[PDB]
Amino acid sequence: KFPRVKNWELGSITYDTLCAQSQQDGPCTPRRCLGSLVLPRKLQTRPSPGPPPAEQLLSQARDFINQYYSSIKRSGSQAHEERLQEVEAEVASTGTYHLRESELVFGAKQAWRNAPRCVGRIQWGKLQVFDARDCSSAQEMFTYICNHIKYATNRGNLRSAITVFPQRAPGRGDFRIWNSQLVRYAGYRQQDGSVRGDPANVEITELCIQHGWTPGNGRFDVLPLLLQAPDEAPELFVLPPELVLEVPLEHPTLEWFAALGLRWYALPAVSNMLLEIGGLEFSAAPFSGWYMSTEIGTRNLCDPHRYNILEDVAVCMDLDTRTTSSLWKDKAAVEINLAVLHSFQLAKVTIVDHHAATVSFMKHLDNEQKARGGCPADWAWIVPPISGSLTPVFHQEMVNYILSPAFRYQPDPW
Amino acid sequence: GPKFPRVKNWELGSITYDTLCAQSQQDGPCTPRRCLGSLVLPRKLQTRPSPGPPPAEQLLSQARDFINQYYSSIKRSGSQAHEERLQEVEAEVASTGTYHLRESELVFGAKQAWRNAPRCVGRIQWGKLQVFDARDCSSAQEMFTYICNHIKYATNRGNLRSAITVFPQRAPGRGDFRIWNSQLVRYAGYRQQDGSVRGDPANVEITELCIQHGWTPGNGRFDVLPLLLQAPDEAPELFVLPPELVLEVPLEHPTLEWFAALGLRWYALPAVSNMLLEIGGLEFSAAPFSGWYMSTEIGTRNLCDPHRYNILEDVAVCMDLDTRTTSSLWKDKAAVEINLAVLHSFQLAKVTIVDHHAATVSFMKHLDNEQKARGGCPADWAWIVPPISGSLTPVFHQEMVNYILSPAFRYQPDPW
Numbered sequence: 001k002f003p004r005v006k007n008w009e010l011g012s013i014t015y016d017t018l019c020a021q022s023q024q025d026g027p028c029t030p031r032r033c034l035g036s037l038v039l040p041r042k043l044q045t046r047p048s049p050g051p052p053p054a055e056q057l058l059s060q061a062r063d064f065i066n067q068y069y070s071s072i073k074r075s076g077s078q079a080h081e082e083r084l085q086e087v088e089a090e091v092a093s094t095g096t097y098h099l100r101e102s103e104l105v106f107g108a109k110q111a112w113r114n115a116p117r118c119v120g121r122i123q124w125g126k127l128q129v130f131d132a133r134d135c136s137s138a139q140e141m142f143t144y145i146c147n148h149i150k151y152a153t154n155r156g157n158l159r160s161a162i163t164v165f166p167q168r169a170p171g172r173g174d175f176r177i178w179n180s181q182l183v184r185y186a187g188y189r190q191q192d193g194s195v196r197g198d199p200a201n202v203e204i205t206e207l208c209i210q211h212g213w214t215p216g217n218g219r220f221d222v223l224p225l226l227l228q229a230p231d232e233a234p235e236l237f238v239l240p241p242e243l244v245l246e247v248p249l250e251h252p253t254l255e256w257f258a259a260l261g262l263r264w265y266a267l268p269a270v271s272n273m274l275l276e277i278g279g280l281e282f283s284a285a286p287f288s289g290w291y292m293s294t295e296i297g298t299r300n301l302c303d304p305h306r307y308n309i310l311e312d313v314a315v316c317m318d319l320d321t322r323t324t325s326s327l328w329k330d331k332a333a334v335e336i337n338l339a340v341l342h343s344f345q346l347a348k349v350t351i352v353d354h355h356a357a358t359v360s361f362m363k364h365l366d367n368e369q370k371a372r373g374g375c376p377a378d379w380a381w382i383v384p385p386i387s388g389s390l391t392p393v394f395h396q397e398m399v400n401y402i403l404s405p406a407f408r409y410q411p412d413p414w
Numbered sequence: 415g416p417k418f419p420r421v422k423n424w425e426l427g428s429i430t431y432d433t434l435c436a437q438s439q440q441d442g443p444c445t446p447r448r449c450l451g452s453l454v455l456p457r458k459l460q461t462r463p464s465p466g467p468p469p470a471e472q473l474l475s476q477a478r479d480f481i482n483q484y485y486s487s488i489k490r491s492g493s494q495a496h497e498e499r500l501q502e503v504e505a506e507v508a509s510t511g512t513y514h515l516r517e518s519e520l521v522f523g524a525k526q527a528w529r530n531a532p533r534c535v536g537r538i539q540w541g542k543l544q545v546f547d548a549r550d551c552s553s554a555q556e557m558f559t560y561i562c563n564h565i566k567y568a569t570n571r572g573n574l575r576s577a578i579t580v581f582p583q584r585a586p587g588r589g590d591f592r593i594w595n596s597q598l599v600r601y602a603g604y605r606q607q608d609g610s611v612r613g614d615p616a617n618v619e620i621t622e623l624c625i626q627h628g629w630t631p632g633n634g635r636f637d638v639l640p641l642l643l644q645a646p647d648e649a650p651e652l653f654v655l656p657p658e659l660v661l662e663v664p665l666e667h668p669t670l671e672w673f674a675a676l677g678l679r680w681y682a683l684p685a686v687s688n689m690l691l692e693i694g695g696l697e698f699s700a701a702p703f704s705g706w707y708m709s710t711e712i713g714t715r716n717l718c719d720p721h722r723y724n725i726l727e728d729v730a731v732c733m734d735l736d737t738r739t740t741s742s743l744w745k746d747k748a749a750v751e752i753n754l755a756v757l758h759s760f761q762l763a764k765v766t767i768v769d770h771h772a773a774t775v776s777f778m779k780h781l782d783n784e785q786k787a788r789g790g791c792p793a794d795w796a797w798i799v800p801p802i803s804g805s806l807t808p809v810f811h812q813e814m815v816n817y818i819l820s821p822a823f824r825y826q827p828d829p830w
């Protein structure tokens with residue numbers, strides 16, 4: 001039942017007993033493993049044709065309340081039994097319930113802790129939770145978002161934060177941030193099918209223009225936010241420049257790197273995922289921490305379907321682009337990730353390289369084994385995009401499963 | 415849409431459906447509750463030893479399935495020869511309790527096992543495999559002759575050729591034919607007095623077994639080990655491979671002149687020998703196979719792994735990198751030059767080798783070929799994506815479905 005987990009670098013073994021607490025099913029079966037798929041339509045928390053069955057919601061709620069009181073050690077106190085009574089009364093009468101701010105804070109931190117694809121969970125206990133459940137308009141969503149950004153950025157000394165907007169109600173539309181991240185660069189599909197900017201943001205850039213945004217023509221034009229209040233069309237909001245801290249990229253030894261004009265924002269804030277706590281769903285709950293260098297230098301800048309700068313840098317470095325055997329791609333990529341670490345460190349902006357991050361994740365796995373008897377992790381996401389075996393996580397076996405609270409993927413509002 | 419796993423390529427945005435997984439009849443380690451896809455040896459890819467013959471009914475169903483596969487590949491499914499062969503197999507199983515393959519059935523099954531191997535990135539070459547039938551072999555000495563012939567053929571003075579030698583299958587009430595070594599060519603791993611290791615740390619055990627069996631050890635980092643060959647119901651016999659048979663490549667860097675001075679090297683022929691070839695329910699406990707290397711296997715894993723040669727620090731010190739901090743990316747820089755050295759040295763010595771870019775690109779082609787041919791291709795993402803420069807490679811952005819198909823190459827417990 002319980003999987004034997006092994007580290008091949010050190011020969012050490014552990015048994016994951018935490019996976020037994022999983023109540024939600026993944027995409028795999030004994031016939032075939034689908035663990036490398038980014039998003040199966042299954043785990044995804046899509047819309048519904050009404051209110052969840054009261055029995056199911058109630059059991060997820062009682063479970064969460066049980067988790068919370070256990071955390072503060074008051075498991076069994078009258079406060080626990082009374083909170084469970086309150087939840088039952090509210091659900092039975094209204095088909096739903098609401099969380100207290102202390103519970104929402106514990107829930108947000110626990111959802112991060114339970115996030116399989118996250119390599120920075122060693123910081124899970126240090127999270128600023130902004131309660132925005134008293135938001136009623138898109139204009140309000142914007143002020144809360146700007147507050148999140150100003151707080152998280154902190155002049156360069158980044159701080160992990162999450163802003164939780166109103167939960168989903170069966171009788172109305174969701175509060176949604178249409179942008180995948182709070183900060184994104186525009187992607188303009190040119191004449192020749194080409195793309196000026198970030199090709200990953202072509203669809204959202206089009207939507208922004210459609211809703212009245214006057215576009216630019218640069219490779220790094222920060223997009224405005226499309227915030228949606230229940231059953232209302234999304235509204236356009238331009239982010240104040242002083243709020244968006246950006247870092248111009250230059251290399252420590254290659255003088256010509258700066259000339260490439262590359263730059264990336266400091267704040268990584270995912271804004272399209274759904275936070276589920278005790279059966280309650282928060283369709284708008286942007287979260288942010290700090291970047292791991294490979295996200296920018298390898299994925300964002302070197303992916304073929306992204307900025308695709310590999311060959312440009314290779315030519316500047318004057319490498320042999322004729323054959324793959326010269327390893328020109330590998331050489332260019334290393335210098336690009338180096339430029340990212342150098343530039344952010346020069347600008348006094350928080351980053352963490354993949355070696356430092358993965359070593360900390362290994363410590364986190366150890367903390368978790370002793371604390372909960374395991375830790376759900378997605379090997380394909382945890383192992384960085386370059387120099388995989390050069391990091392300790394590559395040599396670590398991992399067990400992946402879904403625990404709640406959890407951040408889940410959800411359908412696009414359009 | 416369709417009731418089969420939807421597979422996507424994120425670089426190109428293309429979609430495909432895996433229908434081939436529908437043919438899988440062997441369960442993997444995963445369940446709807448948890449994914450155990452990253453485990454090297456879950457007890458689902460490993461064939462334990464059968465001290466007793468497989469139940470006639472279970473074996474016969476596996477046998478029928480294989481015969482059906484064979485006749486389908488030659489396009490004579492449902493034919494007279496097909497129904498005859500099926501009858502012939504159940505006749506053998508009826509009286510003897512086992513059966514035997516025809517020459518062409520073994521060649522087909524051996525090629526299909528490679529084709530079905532989820533952890534192999536070189537499957538674009540699956541149709542070109544030299545199958546040596548050694549099912550007549552009766553002694554440990556003969557196994558040696560066969561292995562030596564295999565090495566000569568496969569090595570071909572640098573112009574490597576994929577090959578596999580199949581020894582007699584598992585027989586009920588008789589010992590197995592087993593090659594104790596993990597590969598035909600392995601470097602010794604000497605356990606030092608202080609606790610460290612000289613040579614290859616991966617080979618500490620087998621080295622100790624060779625010593626317990628009469629081998630007189632050396633004291634270098636790259637000492638080729640002798641073979642511990644086992645014939646049925648007999649103790650393993652030690653056989654030293656003649657030096658001229660084992661082609662090696664001294665490592666040197668194209669620009670970093672001091673790299674040659676490091677005295678590093680690696681053998682040309684990658685030949686796995688501790689794996690079990692399962693065809694139609696028949697188990698070939700000894701069936702070494704070989705191809706050619708992918709640069710990262712040597713330069714990244716064998717030479718840079720912390721539990722292997724671990725040379726990253728040595729090379730970084732020579733390149734004068736800041737090994738005091740992670741942010742200098744000294745490990746990344748060094749590893750790149752080490753991989754470049756492996757590629758350069760093999761090309762210079764005219765020994766076949768393929769870099770991780772070329773190999774993965776050819777695996778994408780294979781994936782496209784198999785989509786059209788079988789409606790999918792079982793692939794282990796963790797093993798298909800190279801140990802360095804993952805996303806710079808096209809397979810990283812390719813979702814894969816993993817399942818067990820037979821014939822198959824399966825793990826098996828150590829003879830000892």
Ligand code: HEM
Pocket residue numbers: 108112115117118119120121123127160161162270287288289290291292295352357381407
């Ligand atoms: C403290 C700094 C942190 C670092 C360095 C870090 C790093 C990472 C990395 C490398 C990824 C993969 C990103 C990608 O490839 O798209 C990731 C994903 C993720 N992280 Fe963390 N993380 C941190 C903080 C956070 C915080 C504050 C939360 C939530 C409260 C969080 C939630 C997650 C989740 C849910 C994912 C999956 C994202 C997705 O599926 O797109 N992370 N993190």
Ligand code: HEM
Pocket residue numbers: 524528531533534535536537539543576577578703704705706707708711768773823
């Ligand atoms: C023609 C060249 C070939 C190349 C470049 C190639 C490359 C690879 C690579 C890189 C691996 C990973 C090994 C590791 O990381 O330990 C692998 C695994 C494997 N290959 Fe291939 N391969 C080729 C030929 C063969 C042949 C001839 C067979 C069999 C007839 C084969 C069967 C397999 C199997 C079953 C594995 C699994 C390894 C394990 O489970 O330990 N390959 N191959």
Ligand SMILES: C[C@H](O)[C@H](O)[C@H]1CNc2nc(N)[nH]c(=O)c2N1
Pocket residue numbers: 036037038380381382424810811812813814
């Ligand atoms: C197909 C494959 O799952 C996909 O390319 C994954 C692999 N690992 C990843 N890992 C991280 N951190 N982020 C990603 O976007 C991906 N993409």
Ligand SMILES: C[C@H](O)[C@H](O)[C@H]1CNc2nc(N)[nH]c(=O)c2N1
Pocket residue numbers: 008394395396397398452453454796797798
């Ligand atoms: C734990 C993890 O499965 C293990 O380190 C795997 C990862 N991917 C691999 N991939 C290949 N090709 N070869 C290996 O030996 C491994 N080891």
Ligand SMILES: [Zn+2]
Pocket residue numbers: 028032033034035444448449450451
């Ligand atoms: Zn799985």
